[model samples]
Target: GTCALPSTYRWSSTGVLAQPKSGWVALKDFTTVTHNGRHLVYGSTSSGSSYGSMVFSPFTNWSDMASAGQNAMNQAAVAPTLFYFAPKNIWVLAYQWGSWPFIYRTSSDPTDPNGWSAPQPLFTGSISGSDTGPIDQTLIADGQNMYLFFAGDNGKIYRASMPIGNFPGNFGSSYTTIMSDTKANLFEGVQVYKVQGQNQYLMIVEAMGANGRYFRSFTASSLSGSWTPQAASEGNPFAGKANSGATWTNDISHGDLVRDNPDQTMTVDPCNLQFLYQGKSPNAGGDYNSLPWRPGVLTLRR
Candidate 1:
């Protein structure tokens, strides 16, 4: 009986994460963190930033993930985010450079392309807008602080915290703006889940909409702010129309948030998260390199 969002979310076109691979010539700003316990997905690609995902089960084998040292971080770019820093049993990655965030670490996993650990600057300076930062960023963990949100190219919504196992190093020299809005434009892929076994909190955003980009859901119990607004989308662009709408794509953008328990299990007590977007259809007006960004899902009826 927990977790909150756009009507507790009930949009499932049965596209069920759409699935794409087999020389996938495209994939945009993605993320679906859950290292070591599986359910990975790191993006930015035509062929650069990678980390497999179809929503693991008895399945997972990105034909060997990806290489060239996994593009280090940002070979294609997407403000990616991945986590699992279990007491230096490492595996932390947060993408987006040119405005901040380009940290990297590894302990030989993610189909290791040769023990990685090259990109540093794990945040302690630019808190957004060095030119273009925080368009998307999210990393979570409960048991005692491991948050680290971003989405503030001035649109506001910044946060920082570390020490649940520590060592993603220097995630703060400044941070803590909670969230703001002149009306939302780039609160970027917020996705800050934490409802397993309930204390309830989720800040999911892939925002900005009058009719161009959408998907919003916010609800918090803590994180230094009241952070309200529980669920959105009077169906503006929550990804619905297909094919005949002249392929408008329902306008969906950015994505990442998974756990439908294909073994992606979490604590207990009614946890079945889902929502991994990118469906911008034939409306790549914002161009994002001619968007066609696939993969989509938004489940939870149970």
Candidate 2:
């Protein structure tokens, strides 16, 4: 079950994706998936009722997808995570419907925005009361299970598991609160990662810090087990003055992690090496609408 990454990664300071004649636009609640050999990305920037835009590009180039509209995924279909289930021969897009995880499926090319089916409510947006997904979506698959971490509004992160590589139903409606943050820095978007060639895994929640917006992590030996919060320095902030500096907008917000190509090995354990986030200038003050939220990366180096 070994895989590779596009780049080798280790410990390093974070960096920005906006710079020197860049083409990236200010986007929010961004998520991505590698499917059909294409690096596809999605994010929310609703004008009127549209959720946002979708695009495909080379990993480093960061080129925007052309004319790709949000289509039916608008309004409450805000936070999104996309993945292709090879077993089912369908692409799955998961988002939030208030406090529930909404699921959508499509059999068309995932690189194209016009190819998806209208999103359908999964488990009827919390067929039960245990499904607490008020904010975001992140996905990971292992062995026989594809686990969806729900960004709960109740201060705890919730989890639901469905059968591996298959039709997207038959999920365990009853969920488990993997961890919680009573301090409540977590506004939304929860990410769980399993390092390649490493036995341990970690979960990151988007939380605010003294340095601005960053992630808080809970690490565990196994996906289901006792978890420990990393020391303060272990977690990272969105690229900011104290970290990556002026190169980045430094005004942090929500984002997603980008794993390297499946051919490169990460020398460091328990790290993504690179992450995509939404942010703008701190000078823009606290007005979200004023800061042009564009895509940026905080890279870890060897």
Candidate 3:
């Protein structure tokens, strides 16, 4: 049976579908990952009366067992990379609202939901004239090492990595730059993945200009050189499509391809597509804040 909250401000499950459902549910942001067949979601709940509060939920259950007051925002899970230093363990990395990024690990045992270690900042350096928060992080395990990709406020992709067995707490000392954009407005929702049977890395970035556009970049090796940008699609991939949202996932499980939309929900197949939450509205205003929405997970398959 699913759990419930005593307070009205608490978020309730909208009901779980065969896959994650798309639409608004109080505060449903971030992605979900399954460890040893147990589903866990890491996200933040808007305190309704407050700004941002970090929270985590287990599968179809409702009560948030891990509610740290750390003020976490965009987050990503790195278990799919197979860099499990501990059994049933995964790295949960996130960016603070106005500070540098941080990475934390959940204990292998689920019974100790509070078994999360203290967070350690991942990046060092002053971010001048730009947002300090490193939103949406993507982890890529290249056999021997794990690479982390995040979007800097300057419209560029920055990266950091360490040996496969290194704990996330130690990443702050070994962080390095991968790439950054010279043209597009580097918005949130950055994803990175490797092409099947290829040694190259592909980056999917969300650009905010006239309208939101999806851009792709490729790097020859894992984290040794610069990245080259590819021509973006003519228009927004999620524009005018039903069941579409803006949040996107880098193609990790599937072939290295980019997927995204303007709506808050998306699905992962061979390609990423949008899941429209509303049919049609009378307002005709394109403002996202006017709509009730939340982000859902899209599992990529090879």
Better of 2 and 3 by lDDT: 2
Per-residue alpha-carbon lDDT of model 2 for 40-146, expressed as tens digits? 67666534223455443434344433323333332334666666665665676666653335555454566555566765655333422333444575656666676
Q: Write the per-residue lDDT of candidate 3 for residues 98-204, one digit (tens) a residue.
A: 33444444444422334445545554543434554455565555566656766665666667777766745445634455555453545545555554434555555
Q: In candidate 1, what residue range of length 10 has the lowest lDDT sum?
A: 260-269
Q: Evaluate all candidate structures by whole-model CA lDDT and list the values in order.
A: 0.52, 0.54, 0.38
Return the top candidate by TM-score. 2
| Worst 10 contiguous positions by lDDT, candidate 2 | 261-270
Clashes of 3: 15
Query: TM-score for every candidate vs. truth?
Result: 0.31, 0.73, 0.56
| Model 3 CA lDDT for position 266 | 15
Which scores better on lDDT, 1 or 3?
A: 1
Error of 1 at 259 (Å): 25
Against the true structure, whose lDDT is highest? 2
- Candidate 1 global CA lDDT score: 0.52
Error of 3 at 268 (Å): 9.9
Give the C-alpha miss distance for residue 15 in model 1, angstroms.
23
Model 1: lDDT of residue 203: 70
